[PDB]
Amino acid sequence: SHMCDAFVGTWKLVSSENFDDYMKEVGVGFATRKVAGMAKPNMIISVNGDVITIKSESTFKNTEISFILGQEFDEVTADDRKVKSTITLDGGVLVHVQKWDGKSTTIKRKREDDKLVVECVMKGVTSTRVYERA
Ligand SMILES: O=C1CC(CC(=O)Nc2ccc(Cl)cc2Cl)=NC(=O)N1
C-alpha cells in the first residue's frame, strides 16, 4: 500500500461554492464558465506504481492526467490553458500547482471524513468543491 490509497476510487461531485468566481479569476470566458459550471463531474483516481492518474468525466469534458509526484508535466486544462503542472503530497494533501503566462493557481485535494474536498485558489479567490464516493 500507499498513503495515496485514501484517494483511490471513483468520486462524484456533491457541492460547489464560488467556482464561477474562481473561473473568472483564472480568466475563463463566459460561455465556457456557464457550461463548465453546470457540470457535475466524476473524479476517478488510480495509482499504478509511482504513476498517479486523475480523470475528470462530465458532460462538458473528459480529461485525464497521469504524473509522478514532484515531477513537472505539461497539462492542457479543460478551459484550454497550456500549463506547467507539478503535484506533490504534503502532509497527506495532494497539492497541484499550475503555471502559465506568469500566472499561478493551486488545487488542493484532501480527504475529510468520507469526502474528498477540492480547494482551488487563484490569488484571493477560493472555490471549494466536495466529492463523495460513487
Ligand atoms: O480536480 C479538480 C480540479 C478542479 C479545478 C477545475 O476543474 N478547473 C477547471 C475546470 C474546467 C474549466 Cl472550463 C475551468 C477550470 Cl478553472 N475542480 C474540481 O472539482 N476538481
Curated annotation (Swiss-Prot):
One Pfam family cited in the UniProt record for this chain: Lipocalin
Molecular-function annotations in GO: fatty acid binding; hormone receptor binding; long-chain fatty acid binding; long-chain fatty acid transmembrane transporter activity
The protein's role, per its UniProt record: Lipid transport protein in adipocytes. Binds both long chain fatty acids and retinoic acid. Delivers long-chain fatty acids and retinoic acid to their cognate receptors in the nucleus.
Assembly description: Monomer. Homodimer. Interacts with PPARG.
Protein family: Belongs to the calycin superfamily. Fatty-acid binding protein (FABP) family.
Domain notes: Forms a beta-barrel structure that accommodates hydrophobic ligands in its interior.
Alphabetical UniProt keywords: Acetylation, Cytoplasm, Lipid-binding, Nucleus, Phosphoprotein, Transport
GO CC list: cytoplasm; cytosol; extracellular exosome; lipid droplet; nucleus
Modified sites of kind N-acetylcysteine: 4
Localization, UniProt: Cytoplasm; Nucleus
The organism's place on the tree of life at top rank: Eukaryota
Motif segment (Nuclear localization signal): 24-34
Keyword Phosphoprotein: yes
Covalent S-S links between cysteines: none
Cross-referenced PANTHER family: FATTY ACID BINDING PROTEIN
Cytoplasm among keywords: yes
Name of the molecule in the record: Fatty acid-binding protein, adipocyte
Location of Phosphoserine modifications: 15
Ligand binding (a fatty acid): 129-131
Modified residues (Phosphotyrosine): 22
Gene Ontology biological process terms in this record: brown fat cell differentiation; cellular response to lithium ion; cellular response to tumor necrosis factor; cholesterol homeostasis; fatty acid transport; long-chain fatty acid transport; negative regulation of DNA-templated transcription; positive regulation of cold-induced thermogenesis
Gene3D superfamilies assigned: 2.40.128.20
